[PDB]
Design a binder for this molecule. Structure first.
Ligand SMILES: NC(=O)c1ccc[n+]([C@@H]2O[C@H](COP(=O)([O-])OP(=O)(O)OC[C@H]3O[C@@H](n4cnc5c(N)ncnc54)[C@H](O)[C@@H]3O)[C@@H](O)[C@H]2O)c1
Ligand SMILES: NC(=O)c1ccc[n+]([C@@H]2O[C@H](COP(=O)([O-])OP(=O)(O)OC[C@H]3O[C@@H](n4cnc5c(N)ncnc54)[C@H](O)[C@@H]3O)[C@@H](O)[C@H]2O)c1
Ligand SMILES: NC(=O)c1ccc[n+]([C@@H]2O[C@H](COP(=O)([O-])OP(=O)(O)OC[C@H]3O[C@@H](n4cnc5c(N)ncnc54)[C@H](O)[C@@H]3O)[C@@H](O)[C@H]2O)c1
Ligand SMILES: NC(=O)c1ccc[n+]([C@@H]2O[C@H](COP(=O)([O-])OP(=O)(O)OC[C@H]3O[C@@H](n4cnc5c(N)ncnc54)[C@H](O)[C@@H]3O)[C@@H](O)[C@H]2O)c1
Lengths: 334, 333, 334, 334
């Protein structure tokens, strides 16, 4: 089996852990965070939005036991000190939010891990992967890889279809986004100095910047710099929606053609629906993106057309499913 | 003073009432709704999002007393039965949500009112007004008028500036919107059969249609049919944001030009800000629209440009302020 | 199989429907509500707090099809007009909220149903059942029965233990409750004239009355009138907690004795836990009540003692699970 | 004028600032927090639950300017290094949450301030004051004082009236409380290791412990140890309610007597209402406690009585109002 260690047992870390239970041939042997065992175990068992963990979870001294299997747990802020070498870690899932750079994440390799997959956009000389859009870029000699962002994974399969079938001139994106752990409960100073992430998360529409906007150019090179846009963080705890408004090379495009193009591209990463669903309907789903055809709009004024589409995503579970597929693929190549 | 009656003492009706207290020369002499006096008075005094009513509110039998002034109240579902004639009502503010058609609203006139201002887009042969964008269209012979929607009021002053200064080819709109009373508390059947407004309002991002998309053509005729878009209803109780993505006639447009063009057009209906505010910051505001310059984007790929802008609005108080200005102007004619 | 018709395909009706799929020998053959098929089918498939319906749901003209089985649907406000006779309905689950009286609910019997089970406290000459507290009261000659309320079901098994083991002098109850469909979205006039249920449901702590307070006397006659209390409706969409503060007949009672007395009484209707859970953790659970031992308090001043306990409950699924057990028992006697 | 410095420009610190503008003879000359000027100024102007600041706020380098008045600002985690001596600070309002101990708070004195008022319960050899209940205990020689907690301020005036008028045997408290800055946005490890405050704040009913429970004994000595209870943190951002269930020395008490006893005691710290208000209705209020007579209950079984009362409080502004009155009183004596 492929020996996985999770750095940062947060939202993405814990769900990665859950999802790996469902997936044969991957084994989490260790976790690292900044807290005690009791906490880690508790937060795995109980999950506000994602539901109770099915299996049995028990605290031991090593760490904790999940359906009989032991999981070593550590409490070490500095990744280079982790005993990855001694536990023959194959791949670290880096989920702390503090190693989002190729050079930083190199700490895990020095500790003894063979590969690192970052659960976010990351700066530096590395590949950025959305599963089922560009994982084929991986030859297996990669040492550090980025799994991109939630939004990127919701967007890439939609943009690919538009660019391939109609030609993408330009587009602007808005993502209507669940609030996350880096927002504040009450209006208060923000670590990164963001005056908007500083505000009460569950009481506000909060404009913010998005990675996706340009992480996208790294995933689909031929549309590099053709897309931009931002986020609106709103008071749902998980579940999100990406709206995309574009100018295409083909005019005389119909709503019917756009939808059919999307359906024909659907797979396990990219779902298709015609049901009038809402955000809570996508909580826990494992498509990386779910095209909602009921939201497709074409605006035609004389010669010229504007096209609008929207895709749903569980920014937690949709991203996690995608990240684990990338993990499994990256591991099968070496 | 100008004799006002409010039909439907709901969210817009009660705030209209409050706003009128701030504004000289308008007097609410009557309200009509579907409940008792105690309830009406209570819901005026206490307000979840808009805060406590400052003055004194006391229930009497006529209805209730507000800072000494009596307000007659009625419990009559059929508008034509209201004693408008006997109380010399000058203008009815129609806020029930059930008379949003010129012919229907005519009931108030038969009851004896001299004019009706509908607090929503309304079908039929009437003018649709966003104050400080097209109120000048009113000549004072109008009998039934629409005050448009809250989204239309957030959008009209933004669209006018783009169309005037840059030439508007086409655009798509998304409004990120507070939930309203015509949504359900828990997933349940919806009166109008909307499978999305049926869902838990405070637990969901809920896609929906918008009036504004095309009430806009009635307010700014020269851009009729050049705009469309929809809503996303989200778990805030009030405060909203209109995002607009457009293709303009001028290319080589800058973020700086767009912003300055908006600032130059600001007045009491159309505010301008460069502060990184969030929705709760606009709760209670009396601008009909607040342009947020931090959100302006310009996307340039070779020859061709996409422009994005965004304006805040308290769907409750921004619209109410705008409706009352329109009321006051309509009355002065 | 036992032929069930659900009147009022609301929160309790739809979940009753879902729960019945899990339970052998009960078959829902009809539903009645005030809307079209597309709506009924849609609201069964998708559920904000309770999650997606697992099976397949397809709209036909009769009504709709669930995992192949047809379900006739009706749009008829007046219960006596329903074709219960023609479909040989054995038991109607009455969930509309508008037939909470023995005489009113008799309409279903005139329509042709054999028994009616009301999903609330109901006035009149009928028995009030909390499953595993007093279902043994049923001899099978009953024609109209009440399934009590969700708070009654969370409280009854707790009060029975206290009264049996310690003797109950008197007590006061507070339930910290999820908001329900009879509260308003925004401050607005309320149908029943309740000035507090009129207020924005998800932005307020809202004091209110509770049925439980005295539905309890009908379930456990020997403590009739010994209990009272009210509700605080708060901004969670489901999941609730009953706090109970009592004077007992034994003094020198210990935390340890109270807890153990509860654990010893636990069954499928009454769960026991020592985990520091929160409301969302009980969403979807099928215990009618979940005793939380971490919340047990005993206050002793000289001779005299006050005792405090707390039980969780998903006001939706906990009540539904209980109602369906009562349905199944009532049908086995019939 | 009395020279005030606010240590910790958070929820209580900023509201203290606002409230001081309304109150003659107190002048804030400095603030300390852990962030830049732009942030401080921004969060004073804009307030999610409390509304926009009325006056003008402008950033300068000293710090910021409020209605023309300069306010120096600092970025210094260690209190003993603040230039309190050089700015002749009379009183520091200590609102960080990190100096809640008489010995720790002594750092401000070494820095040069003349007195410290801690905006929370604080350990060590000091007085704990709820204004209009026990501020008369201050003789002016005090150097470090505690302003108690929000719950204590909501509860003291209610318990004093019950104990003076009926004799308090014993009682249990439940506070249904707004969520605060020390809870998490999403389920995540908690600094203090509280498995409950670790959970999503705006999606949960969260049981927790309360200071009040026994800060109370320090404020009303003669009922020391006669009260206990806890909190339920719920998804409102501000506004709270304290429920109290008590056994009194007088039996044959009536609802009418209890209510009248409270009204007769009302002042600027203790309000009285018979309106069916909800939590949002007390947001911004400056009573330290508002007795709600609609919620008064008396439970009588034969000889023996249980009594229940409830008082509202804006855990932010009610506490702040109370804190400032104590500030003003403390300053007038020294
Ligand atoms: N919707 C989403 O939450 C989402 C989606 C996709 C990607 N991501 C990315 O995933 C990453 C983690 O996000 P999250 O939401 O789980 O955050 P989180 O706060 O819930 O989890 C972060 C975890 O890391 C721990 N931690 C912090 N410093 C550490 C250290 N040096 N060593 C070990 N543990 C440390 C914290 O205890 C916490 O458990 C972020 O980069 C985020 O950008 C988030
Ligand atoms: N954000 C907003 O609330 C918003 C903004 C702009 C315009 N509007 C429009 O204003 C109208 C009402 O808005 P609202 O949100 O105040 O709704 P609301 O539910 O708060 O108010 C409707 C009120 O009228 C009463 N009523 C309903 N039908 C009646 C009848 N037949 N006869 C007498 N009284 C009746 C109701 O009891 C209620 O008080 C709608 O058309 C809406 O589109 C709403
Ligand atoms: N926490 C809870 O939701 C809960 C728990 C226990 C009991 N209950 C009780 O069960 C009953 C249903 O509660 P709910 O929360 O599901 O309500 P709900 O509003 O979600 O559903 C009521 C349904 O009945 C339908 N209906 C109303 N009148 C009808 C009529 N005359 N004919 C046919 N259909 C009609 C409505 O369309 C609606 O779909 C209520 O009495 C409630 O007290 C609710
Ligand atoms: N409902 C309430 O928020 C409430 C009510 C009464 C009392 N209190 C108490 O008041 C205190 C503050 O609570 P709050 O909710 O406003 O917290 P807050 O988080 O909103 O404010 C605390 C502030 O202190 C700053 N800070 C932290 N350490 C500092 C340091 N060493 N030097 C300078 N600044 C520092 C932080 O940046 C933050 O702005 C706590 O003890 C709290 O328990 C809170």
């Amino acid at each position: 089996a492929v020996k996985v260690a999770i750095n940062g047992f947060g939202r993405i870390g814990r769900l990665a852990f859950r999802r790996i239970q469902e997936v044969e041939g991957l084994e989490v042997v260790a976790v690292n965070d900044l807290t005690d065992d009791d906490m880690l175990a508790h937060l795995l068992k109980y999950d506000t939005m994602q539901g109770r963990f099915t299996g049995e979870v028990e605290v031991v001294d090593g760490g904790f036991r999940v359906n009989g299997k032991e999981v070593k747990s550590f409490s070490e802020p500095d990744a280079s000190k982790l005993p990855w070498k001694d536990l023959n870690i194959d791949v670290v899932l880096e989920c702390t939010g503090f190693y989002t750079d190729k050079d930083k994440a190199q700490a895990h390799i020095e500790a003894g891990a063979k590969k690192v997959l970052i659960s976010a956009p990351a700066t530096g000389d590395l590949k950025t992967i959305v599963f089922n859009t560009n994982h084929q870029e991986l030859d297996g000699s990669e040492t550090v890889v980025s799994g991109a962002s939630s939004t990127t994974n919701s967007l890439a399969p939609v943009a690919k279809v538009l660019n391939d079938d109609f030609g993408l001139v330009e587009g602007l994106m808005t993502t209507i986004n669940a609030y996350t752990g880096d927002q504040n409960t009450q209006d208060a100073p923000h670590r990164k100095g963001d005056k908007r992430r500083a505000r009460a998360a569950a009481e506000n529409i909060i404009p913010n910047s998005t990675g996706a906007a340009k992480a996208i150019g790294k995933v689909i090179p031929e549309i590099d710099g053709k897309l931009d846009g931002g986020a609106q963080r709103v008071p749902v705890a998980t579940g999100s929606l990406t709206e995309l408004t574009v100018v295409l090379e083909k005019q005389d495009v119909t709503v019917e053609q756009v939808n059919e193009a999307m359906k024909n591209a659907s797979n396990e990463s990219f779902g298709y629906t015609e049901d009038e669903i809402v955000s809570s309907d996508v909580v826990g789903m494992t498509y990386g993106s779910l095209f909602d055809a009921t939201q497709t709009r074409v605006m035609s004024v004389g010669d010229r057309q504007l096209v609008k589409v929207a895709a749903w995503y569980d920014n937690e579970m949709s991203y996690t499913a995608q990240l684990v597929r990338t993990l499994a693929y990256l591991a099968e190549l070496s």
